[PDB]
Design a protein around this ligand. Structure first.
Ligand code: HEA
Ligand code: HEA
Ligand code: PEF
Ligand code: PEF
Ligand code: CUA
Ligand code: CA
Ligand code: CU
Ligand code: MG
Ligand code: ZN
Lengths: 45, 121, 100, 145, 57, 537, 238, 69, 75, 268, 88, 55
């Protein structure tokens, strides 16, 4: 087991066309979780 | 001692390092129920040689183009941290001693050369 | 705390007197112009002679470049270059500021 | 190497060095090294220029990436402007302000604090008190009309 | 009664990962995987129940 | 099948350096949520009255508590002490890998369930409503009558388990598995900082664990530790918690000290000034960080002598820390400085902001003065100006310094500089006016305020908005780093000396460095160090 | 006495316990401003004068020092001693016990204070007690201070030592008035003691400084100093 | 005497702590003179001796304190 | 009509904490009245001492407890 | 040359180990199930028990791998058997600091009794219904003290290459530990005060339960050690799993000594 | 060489193990039985029981606190509750 | 021979230290003699004026 690393080990794959949507979409959900919490705390008022 | 050295000498692969075994009724000693790296270390220590290469660098003397300091390794490189004349001369500098090439310190000018005590391929 | 600065000057003069390796000369110069002291004109004499011996013109120019950089005032640098002018003519080295 | 090199091989080497082949570079450097063993008094000025450029050049090991500070400044300015505009845009999506945020109420409070002697040293109940008091002014005091 | 050396030599003929090296080890692993899967499936539903406060009835 | 290989590599892994990336990414993910919660808080607190939250107080309390817990327990410690404490120490000291390779993996994998538990807690009927330091009487069954604050305690206990079990193998690694010839006293300063933080964590975490479990039992098993009705004292919890609370505000910062100490000399081309002095200053700060904990309880009403002593032993800490600052200054005077590099920018920006924060801290160490600032916005200004400026900046500097080694790709420089400048300006404007607000006497943890505290809050909200744009820019630059294909050399921070030639340097001086990690290939190998490095005895 | 608009420093107050805190703060700031300016200037100047393009040659052989370190370790110690001496003299002077002439109780309930005086108990047999409730916004008198006004405000005489005893019934509260420089914590089960002495004849506002749940922002405190005759009349009214 | 005897039970805790520490130290010092005894092995015997002496002195103190007539 | 007078400094409780002052005053007053007689004038002093400090929300509880006999004190 | 076929450093290289990803999940299950149960959610008692069984199973599966690697792979060289002691010493230090929190709570609640407790540490009423320290506690401390001598006898007999005596000593030590646990349980079941009774009981039970858990762990460790001995696995010079239990037992002994000195005699 | 050191170490171990066996068989034994006899004697000395006292200063406001009902049993019982010594 | 030239680092360091100390002292002195003393004077004047007016 003596390979040469390929200069990439980021826990996933990145390309331009399709994966860019997934990378920046997953960023939206984490950015929106607290808004979901706030909205759910103000439904029975 | 002689038995240990003879046993160590005649062995081809790591799978051949197995002790004779103990006997029922008495606790077994390390010399008879040790396998793998543990047995390797035990036999090397008994034989008087060193199992692993962990000798610090040779601080005494200064290297020269016609008389370099020999750094032994099992690989075509070995990282060494030079400090220079009797330890404390200049600031510590790390470096890598490539195969078949002379590594000259950029501060004290000492010369180191590699000794490949290993298997080429 | 150890050696003064006058003994440093003498030691580096002695070292520059006898050297026959480009790497040796370059590392000696690197370690010399870092001690807060600019050596006297004799040390520069020896350094230029050594550079001539090892056949490295770029170092012969870089020595004067470093002298100019380290000195604080222009008048001192002008005096330095004036003192070493005849050697510059003899060996044929050309100062950076004149080359371009 | 007792013979000089042709002039065109060394002119303005700074720009030409960018585009070349390893063979040509190696040949040029080895020729220069060979011709540097003769006494320097016989070297041409262009040869000295080329040798200095090759040795203490601005390429190879010492060629650093350049950052245009003008771009950094303009980017920061644009970011600040966008931030301010966004804050202003999401400020107009809130609830109506209280009833005590009116210039008339602020003036009434300023006049009322003088009767009760509040801050009677360097405040609203001082001797001259040419200051502002509780009138934050600006959009914080939209005088009702 | 000392089979230590014999089994020491025998078990070194297997190149499988250390948690499957011993013979007959799948029986103690796969049922465990199934049990953990069931527990996690229940745990998701339990958390969902907790969020919307309600006790089964 | 690639699925099996992927699962083996990333889930059933035992490689020390391949777990650090997981720590870093999870820390970033938690930090995003923390920052968004802070943005909500600061947008609510802009103008007087109920602006955005429809006249809700419990929701705001939940917001502040969750923000504090998320950004102090799940963001800085895992992304700084763990992400960079595992990747560099084995390399820096010259060891194959951590002493216990799978205990580290177990320690990491306790975080995701803890975060999920905290989120479930925040989503229950009420949620944690007592700030990031839950207090006994307000956080007993009488007020929070639901399964909301129980989960938030189990999450903290799980995080404590992870920290106290991951801080043991580091010590066992730096004591027993050093390279031949290298002694303990000669270890790099970053390793010493990591060792000291590990010692502090190991010593202090279990006390908080016990206190939190006592509080948890006081709600369910009918114990009466913190109930004045049964015979307890509600002030005991303060002692037990703050015996750990302070030794945790030094655990957060010290890795930043190490990172700056390793960033300055590398880009200043001069060795650090007085290494032994810095080591002894760090040791003294660590030792003196345990004998001063009650200075958070000046208004509770302790006897005079206790207040006098605890105020006398708090100012002393300012002597050693100060030394460190001077040393870094002494390092800048003399050496060539490349100030345009992003790591140097962050290192320089760290000093000014941290010294301002420390001076502000020294302001409110006296017992007499503390009555005019306790539970006001001056404390908020002080501790934010220290944490979000000395720890966050240290983290960003460490990332921008060591990213090419971990990932093997080079980021953009213009965008990094723009992000740094935006963050600097935004945070400074955010935390400037809070000083005046605290000075004028405005309490903290109030969604609404009197009518005269409007201007400064309205000013600070703008900066709070700008910082989020800075975060967006950081996300974009991190993305662009991964999909640019910009190879990086072995040791990018090596430049020829003044007299070194361009060919002699290339063919005779390459492969040199002042630290081991810069000798290995840019995407460091998996099984590095077949034969250990050696040092002169 | 009350917060101002765009204010920077403290607000005007009147109390012997408040005249010391501000003076000590000014004295300490005198020392701290010099250090702040010096450090920032040194940090900024060390970079402009040693940048790469001006100082290519590094002084890598100077990483030591034995007289500089001593001064580093010594001067801050002197600064700390100089700042500390008053900070202890004032503390011990302030904590001593005078001869109080009146007593009050400030029980901090959930979202409203309960004031009580029992000293004047005599054949009258009417110990005085009342509760302070924040006035709602709609009920505000014209020109009043929103979020800082109460229907019933504590009334005390001026130039007379007063001893305040503080406790609570539900959770940890805090009685805090900056104008008079008072801040103490009401913990359920123990009685905290504080000394107080009004100096001027005015109104002083404050708010609680320890969160108590959902209405931590609606527990204002109002103290009114009045002459002796006015205090006697007010007491006779109740 | 009847005075030192009353003193004994007047302060019985500091004597117990002192004798435990003294036995620990004395045993540890005495045992540090042999060859085939690892450090934990040496400390273990000191722990045992200290516990035994502490127990016996505790029983003695409990017996002595009874004279409260 | 109204004369300013209250409890002065006491050496036993100099610290800020005064939790024990009210308890001690209460117990001492009740022991005082138990002995001698209810008409003893000096005894009355303790009365004031335990009325100027106790929040008056505890005195009622203590009296109610002492009614049946569950008071956690000798008297 | 056989050296070239081995590795250069003595340290250990591990692989796979899928258990760490499962122990954390089981802990999450345990925490959630406990939270649900304490508040009385329907169909939430079997969940807790199954989660606990899963935890025990995963821990056993983990600890099997270490034995497999140490007794067959032969990867426990002279240096790898020193970190396994340093880590245990650090863990013991951590537990020692944890055990001081409860003592701090007890001392704070005892030195300065509140008024509602009668101003005397033993709360009025509860003073007359305490437990005599000249009773079962004395037998328990004597048993725990004489267990150490048996343990040392077993260890030394093992070192001297003797089998019968080592097994006999381990048998006596385990039996005495069981007897101590039984006595403690008996004393628990015959106390006239519950946990929710003032702070005295809430501290006594809290301080004793932790010691009970620690001694149970120690007993399990000794059982594992004796089973390993009986199979002809442990040698005379390499018995790390035994020296790692001796320290735990003696630390428990010392902690019990301190606990009995403080709580039983002083605070009563 | 090796044999001499091993033999000496084994001899020392044997002697010390014999000493500790003697200690644990001749000192740790009698004390155990004596303590057990003392415990039995003191237990028998007060085997009167009759621990049923009611209304004699009951409750005291700090015994049998019920902040939250227990989950096991009816809802107001402890874990090791005993109906023979514990009274309400 | 122009002789060795030395003593450059010390001059620069001393100059920087001197200017830094001068600036710090100037700032502190301005703070203490430009804000504190006028405020104390104003407070004393107000109190004495009130006391005189009381008559
Ligand atoms: C990384 C985090 C961090 C760090 C490093 C510090 C460092 C310090 N902190 Fe603080 N602190 C917090 C995080 C931190 N703190 C938090 C989060 C809270 C709030 C907790 C809560 O909400 O309850 C808090 C609250 C807090 C309080 C409580 C006030 C109150 O609530 O009433 C006090 C009291 O003294 C204090 C003091 C100090 C001091 C003296 C230092 C010192 O370490 C500072 C050292 C630095 C310097 C001294 C400046 C540099 C030195 C020189 C330039 C030399 C010259 C200096 C002199 C001559 C003095 N801080
Ligand atoms: C590390 C700790 C930390 C950090 C970073 C922050 C960041 C911020 N905090 Fe806060 N805060 C606390 C710790 C922190 N805080 C604590 C402990 C409390 C007390 C809670 C309580 O009272 O109980 C508190 C309370 C608190 C209050 C008081 C609320 C109240 O009392 O009512 C406010 C008010 O505005 C506030 C605002 C902010 C803002 C606007 C930011 C940010 O906008 C600052 C700028 C930072 C960013 C924009 C993040 C950028 C992130 C990156 C760039 C990622 C880098 C990652 C890698 C390189 C891997 N926070
Ligand atoms: C509340 C606080 C307690 C929480 C519970 C913690 C429990 C785990 C504690 C750590 C114990 C193991 C550490 C040493 C490992 C080691 O070093 O093992 C190294 C040895 C190596 O063998 P060798 O080299 O001697 O073989 C030499 C051959 N020639 O392998 C073992 O013998 C494995 C032993 C496994 C059993 C250990 C005990 C397991 C825990 C029991 C309690 C479980 C219930 C807990 C309930 C909470
Ligand atoms: C577990 C890990 C803890 C870590 C922190 C340390 C805390 C201290 C140690 C643990 C508590 C010991 C209590 C004393 C034991 C005892 O024996 O209690 C005795 C008492 C009974 O007495 P009685 O009144 O019936 O006697 C009457 C005599 N006539 O039982 C109890 O009331 C209940 C105690 C057990 C409750 C268990 C609930 C567990 C919930 C989940 C916990 C979290 C799990 C997830 C963790 C990641
Ligand atoms: Cu009462 Cu906040
Ligand atoms: Ca608002
Ligand atoms: Cu602190
Ligand atoms: Mg407070
Ligand atoms: Zn060297």
């Amino acid at each position: 087991s003596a390979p040469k690393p390929g200069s990439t080990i980021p826990f996933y794959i990145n390309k331009k066309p399709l994966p860019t949507l997934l990378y920046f979409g997953t960023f939206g959900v984490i950015f929106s979780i607290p808004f979901i919490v706030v909205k759910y705390h103000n439904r029975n008022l | 001692v002689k038995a240990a050295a003879q046993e160590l000498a005649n062995a081809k692969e790591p799978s051949d390092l197995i002790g004779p075994g103990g006997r029922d009724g008495e606790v077994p000693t390390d010399l008879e129920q040790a396998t793998g790296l543990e047995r390797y270390e035990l036999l090397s220590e008994l034989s008087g040689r060193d199992a692993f290469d962990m000798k610090p660098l040779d601080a005494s003397r200064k290297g020269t183009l016609t008389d370099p300091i020999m750094v032994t390794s099992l690989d075509p490189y070995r990282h060494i941290g030079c400090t220079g004349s009797p330890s404390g001369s200049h600031n510590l500098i790390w470096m890598t001693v490539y195969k078949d090439k002379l590594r000259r310190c950029p501060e004290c000018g000492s010369v180191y050369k590699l000794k490949f005590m290993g298997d080429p391929n | 705390h150890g050696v003064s600065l006058e003994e440093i000057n003498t030691k580096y003069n002695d070292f520059f007197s006898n050297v026959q390796d480009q790497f040796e000369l370059q590392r000696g110069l690197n370690n010399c112009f870092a001690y807060d002291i600019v050596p006297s004109s004799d040390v520069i004499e020896q350094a230029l002679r050594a550079a001539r011996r090892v056949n490295d013109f770029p170092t012969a120019v870089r020595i004067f470049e470093g002298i100019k950089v380290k000195l604080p005032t222009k008048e001192q640098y002008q005096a330095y270059v004036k003192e070493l002018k005849p050697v510059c003519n003899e060996l044929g080295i050309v100062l950076k500021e004149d080359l371009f | 190497g007792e013979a000089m090199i042709a002039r065109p091989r060394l002119v303005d080497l700074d720009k030409r060095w960018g585009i070349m082949s390893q063979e040509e570079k190696d040949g040029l450097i080895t020729d220069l090294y060979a011709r540097q063993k003769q006494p320097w008094t016989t070297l041409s000025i262009e040869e000295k220029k080329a040798a200095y450029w090759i040795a203490f050049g601005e390429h190879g090991p010492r060629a650093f990436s350049h950052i245009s500070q003008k771009t950094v400044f303009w980017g920061t300015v644009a970011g600040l402007t966008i931030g301010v505009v966004l804050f202003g845009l999401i400020r107009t999506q809130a609830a109506p302000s209280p009833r005590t945020m009116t210039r008339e109420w602020q003036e009434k409070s300023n006049e009322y604090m003088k009767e009760n002697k509040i801050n009677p040293i360097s405040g609203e109940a001082s001797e001259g008190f040419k200051g502002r008091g509780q009138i934050s002014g600006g959009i914080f005091s939209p005088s009702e009309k | 009664k000392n089979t230590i050396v014999q089994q020491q030599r025998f078990l070194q003929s297997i190149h499988k990962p250390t948690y499957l090296q011993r013979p007959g080890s799948f029986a103690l692993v796969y049922p465990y995987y199934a049990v953990m899967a069931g527990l996690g499936l229940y745990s998701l539903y339990a958390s969902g129940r907790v969020i919307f406060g309600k006790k089964d009835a | 099948n690639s699925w099996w290989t992927y699962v083996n590599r990333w889930i059933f892994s035992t490689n020390a350096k391949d777990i650090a990336i997981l720590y870093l990414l999870f820390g970033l993910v938690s930090g995003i949520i923390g920052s968004v919660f802070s943005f909500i808080i600061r947008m609510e607190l802009s103008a007087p009255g109920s602006q955005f939250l429809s006249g809700n107080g419990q929701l705001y309390n939940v917001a502040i508590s969750a923000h504090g817990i998320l950004m102090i327990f799940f963001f800085i410690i895992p992304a700084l002490f763990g992400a960079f404490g595992n990747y560099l120490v084995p390399l820096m000291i010259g060891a194959p890998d951590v002493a216990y390779p799978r205990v580290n993996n177990f320690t990491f994998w306790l975080l995701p369930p803890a975060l999920m538990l905290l989120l479930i807690s925040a989503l229950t009927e009420e949620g944690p409503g007592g700030g990031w330091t839950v207090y006994p009487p307000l956080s007993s069954i009488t007020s929070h009558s639901g399964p909301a604050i129980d989960l938030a305690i189990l999450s903290l206990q799980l995080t404590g388990i992870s920290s106290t079990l991951g801080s043991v193998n580091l010590i066992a690694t730096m004591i027993n598995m050093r390279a031949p010839g290298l002694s303990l006293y000669q270890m790099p300063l970053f390793a010493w900082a990591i060792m000291i933080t590990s010692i502090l964590l190991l010593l202090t975490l279990p006390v908080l664990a016990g206190g939190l479990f006592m509080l948890f039992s006081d709600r369910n098993l009918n114990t009466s530790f913190y109930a004045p009705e049964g015979g307890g004292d509600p002030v005991l919890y303060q002692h037990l918690f703050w015996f750990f609370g302070h030794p945790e505000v030094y655990i957060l910062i010290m890795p930043a000290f190490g990172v700056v100490s390793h960033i300055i000399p590398s880009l200043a081309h001069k060795p650090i000034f007085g290494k032994e002095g810095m080591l002894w200053a760090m040791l003294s700060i660590a030792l003196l960080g345990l004998m001063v904990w009650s200075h958070h309880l000046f208004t509770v009403g302790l006897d005079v002598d206790t207040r006098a002593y605890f105020s006398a032993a708090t100012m002393v800490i300012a002597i050693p820390t100060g030394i460190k600052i001077f040393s870094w200054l002494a390092t800048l005077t003399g050496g060539a400085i490349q100030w345009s590099r992003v790591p140097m920018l962050y290192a320089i920006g760290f000093l000014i902001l941290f010294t301002i924060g420390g001076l502000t801290g020294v302001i409110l160490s006296n017992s007499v003065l503390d009555i005019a600032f306790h539970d006001t916005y001056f404390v908020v200004a002080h501790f934010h100006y220290v944490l979000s400026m000395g720890a966050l900046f240290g983290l960003c500097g460490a990332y921008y310094y060591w990213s090419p080694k971990m990932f093997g790709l080079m980021y953009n420089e213009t965008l990094a500089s723009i992000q740094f400048w935006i963050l600097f300006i935004g945070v400074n404007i955010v935390f400037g006016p809070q000083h005046f607000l605290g000075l004028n006497g405005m309490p903290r943890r109030i969604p609404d305020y009197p009518e005269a505290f409007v201007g400064w809050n309205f000013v600070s909200s703008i900066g709070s908005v700008i910082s989020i744009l800075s975060l967006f820019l950081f996300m974009y630059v991190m993305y662009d780093q991964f999909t640019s294909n910009r190879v990086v050399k072995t040791n990018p921070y090596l430049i020829p000396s003044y007299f070194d030639d361009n060919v002699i340097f290339v063919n005779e001086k390459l492969g040199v460095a002042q630290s081991i990690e810069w000798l290995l290939h840019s995407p460091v190998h998996e099984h590095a160090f077949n034969t250990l490095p050696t040092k002169s005895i | 006495d009350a917060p101002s608009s765009w204010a920077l420093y403290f607000q005007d107050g009147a109390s012997p316990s408040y005249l010391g805190v501000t003076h000590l703060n000014d004295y300490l700031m005198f020392y701290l401003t010099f250090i702040f300016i010096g450090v920032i200037y040194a940090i900024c100047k060390a970079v402009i004068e040693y940048n790469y393009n001006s100082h290519p040659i590094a002084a890598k052989y100077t990483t030591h020092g034995s007289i500089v370190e001593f001064i580093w370790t010594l001067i801050p110690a002197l600064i700390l001693i100089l700042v500390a001496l008053p900070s202890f003299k004032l503390l011990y002077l302030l904590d001593e016990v005078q001869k109080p002439s009146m007593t009050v109780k400030a029980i901090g309930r959930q979202w409203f204070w309960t004031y009580e005086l029992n000293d004047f108990v005599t054949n009258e047999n009417e110990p005085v007690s009342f509760d302070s409730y924040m006035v709602p916004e709609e009920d505000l008198e014209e020109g009043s201070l929103r979020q800082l006004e109460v229907d019933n405000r504590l009334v005390l005489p001026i130039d007379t030592r007063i001893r305040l005893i503080l406790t609570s019934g539900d959770v940890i509260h805090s009685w805090a008035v900056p104008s008079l420089g008072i801040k103490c914590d009401c913990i359920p089960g123990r009685l905290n003691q504080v000394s107080l002495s009004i100096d001027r004849e005015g109104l002083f506002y404050g708010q609680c400084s320890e969160l108590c749940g959902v209405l931590h922002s609606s527990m204002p405190i109002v103290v009114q100093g009045v002459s002796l005759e006015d205090f006697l009349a007010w007491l006779e009214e109740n | 005497n009847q005075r030192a005897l009353y003193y004994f039970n007047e302060h019985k805790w500091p004597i117990i702590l002192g004798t435990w520490a003294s036995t620990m130290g004395l045993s540890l010092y005495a045992a540090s003179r042999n060859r085939y005894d690892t450090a934990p092995q040496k400390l273990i015997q000191a722990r045992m001796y200290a516990q035994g002496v502490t127990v016996v002195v505790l029983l003695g103190s409990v017996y002595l304190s009874t004279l409260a007539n | 009509q109204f004369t300013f007078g209250t409890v002065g400094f006491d050496a036993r409780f100099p610290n800020t904490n005064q939790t024990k002052h009210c308890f001690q005053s209460y117990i001492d007053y009740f022991r005082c009245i138990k002995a001698k007689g209810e008409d003893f004038v000096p005894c009355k002093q303790f009365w004031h001492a335990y009325q100027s400090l106790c929040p008056m929300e505890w005195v009622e509880r203590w009296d109610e407890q002492r009614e049946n006999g569950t008071f956690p004190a000798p008297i | 040359n056989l050296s070239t076929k081995f590795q250069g450093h003595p340290y250990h290289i591990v692989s796979a180990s899928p258990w760490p990803f499962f122990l954390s999940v089981v802990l999450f299950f345990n925490c959630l199930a406990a939270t649900l149960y304490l508040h009385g959610y329907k169909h939430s008692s079997v969940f807790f028990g199954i989660s606990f069984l899963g935890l025990l199973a995963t821990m056993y599966l983990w600890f099997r791998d270490m034995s497999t690697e140490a007794n067959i792979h032969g990867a426990h060289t002279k240096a790898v058997t020193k970190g396994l002691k340093i880590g245990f010493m650090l863990f013991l230090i951590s537990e020692t600091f944890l055990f001081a929190s409860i003592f701090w709570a007890f001392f704070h609640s005892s030195l300065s009794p509140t008024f509602e407790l009668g101003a005397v540490w033993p709360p009025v009423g509860i003073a007359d219904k305490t437990i005599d320290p000249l009773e079962v506690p004395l037998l328990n401390t004597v048993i725990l003290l004489t267990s150490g001598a048996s343990l040392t006898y077993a260890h030394y007999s093992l070192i001297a290459r003797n089998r019968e005596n080592a097994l006999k000593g381990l048998y006596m030590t385990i039996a005495l530990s069981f007897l101590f646990l039984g006595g403690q349980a008996y004393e628990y079941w015959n106390a006239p005060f519950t946990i929710s009774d003032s702070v005295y009981g809430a501290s006594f039970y809290f301080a004793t339960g932790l010691h009970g858990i620690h001694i149970i762990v120690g007993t399990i460790l000794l059982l594992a050690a004796t089973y390993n001995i009986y199979t002809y696995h442990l040698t005379n010079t390499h018995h790390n799993g035994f020296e790692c239990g001796i320290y735990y037992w003696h630390f428990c002994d010392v902690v019990w000594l301190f606990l009995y000195l403080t709580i039983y005699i002083w605070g009563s | 060489n090796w044999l001499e050191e091993v033999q000496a170490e084994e001899e020392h171990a044997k002697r010390s193990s014999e000493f500790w066996k003697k200690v644990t068989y001749y000192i740790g034994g009698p004390a155990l039985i004596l303590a057990s006899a003392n415990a039995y004697y003191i237990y028998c000395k007060h085997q009167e029981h009759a621990k049923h006292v009611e209304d004699t200063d009951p409750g005291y406001s700090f015994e049998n606190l019920r902040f939250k009902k227990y989950p096991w049993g009816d809802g107001s019982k402890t874990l090791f509750w005993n109906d023979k010594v514990n009274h309400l | 021979a122009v002789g060795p030239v030395t003593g450059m680092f010390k001059r620069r360091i001393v100059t920087d230290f001197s200017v830094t100390m001068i600036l710090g002292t100037l700032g502190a002195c301005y703070w203490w003699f430009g804000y504190h003393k006028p405020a104390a004077r104003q407070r004393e004047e107000f109190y004495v004026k009130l006391a005189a007016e009381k008559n």
